[PDB]
Design a protein around this ligand. Structure first.
Ligand SMILES: Cc1cc2nc3c(=O)[nH]c(=O)nc-3n(C[C@H](O)[C@H](O)[C@H](O)COP(=O)(O)O)c2cc1C
Ligand SMILES: Nc1ncnc2c1ncn2[C@@H]1O[C@H](COP(=O)(O)OP(=O)(O)O)[C@@H](O)[C@H]1O
Ligand SMILES: [Mg+2]
Length: 149
């Protein structure tokens, strides 16, 4: 009902299970439990696409997962952002600025690491396309991000 995205929020980038880069070749920046549990109720668990900036850096496209990761069966709900951008160094401890702008699909279980990697890869592409809609690109100019720098 709060599908009145975009939804903005900032979170400190903290350690996850060490699975993204290591198992999937897809790192995700993880938010602290306090940020996740304080998310608006209307935000469903699932996979979204949107914008993000690390610190006072530039805004880039991204996909973010909000849930329990059915494949790994996590106990605590998480919020993980994968930015479609190549960074030279890791940014643990930095503040990640985020704008969730659209819903892609819900979290799923898979029969193999391969199937999951492939689905995630799929979200990234779909995201790459949808974020081009001008209505969405404007979001990238929102004051919320101008203040980041
Ligand atoms: C766009 C995207 C889609 C995802 N979809 C699923 C999913 O459908 N099922 C699932 O179990 N985990 C999903 N994940 C979460 C990953 O399983 C998780 O980020 C990965 O295991 C790394 O965890 P970590 O950051 O603690 O190392 C998704 C993550 C991203 C970024
Ligand atoms: N494009 C990116 N998107 C998200 N994180 C990135 C990216 N590039 C580098 N990183 C680094 O990788 C980390 C996440 O990697 P991951 O393997 O999921 O480890 P973790 O389980 O500790 O979050 C981020 O905290 C960040 O420091
Ligand atoms: Mg991660």
């Amino acid at each position: 009902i709060m599908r009145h995205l975009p939804y903005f929020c900032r979170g400190q980038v903290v350690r996850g299970f060490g699975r993204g880069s290591k198992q999937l070749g897809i790192p995700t920046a993880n938010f602290p439990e306090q940020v996740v549990d304080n998310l608006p109720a209307d935000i469903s668990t699932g996979i979204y696409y949107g914008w993000a900036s690390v610190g006072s850096g530039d805004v880039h496209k991204m996909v973010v997962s909000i849930g329990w990761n059915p494949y790994y069966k996590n106990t605590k709900k998480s919020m993980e952002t994968h930015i479609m951008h190549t960074f030279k160094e890791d940014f643990y401890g930095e503040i990640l600025n985020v704008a969730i702008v659209g819903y892609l699909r819900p979290e799923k279980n898979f029969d193999s690491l391969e199937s999951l990697i492939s689905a995630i890869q799929g979200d990234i592409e779909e995201a790459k396309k949808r974020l081009e809609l001008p209505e969405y690109l404007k979001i990238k100019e929102d004051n919320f991000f101008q203040v980041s720098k």
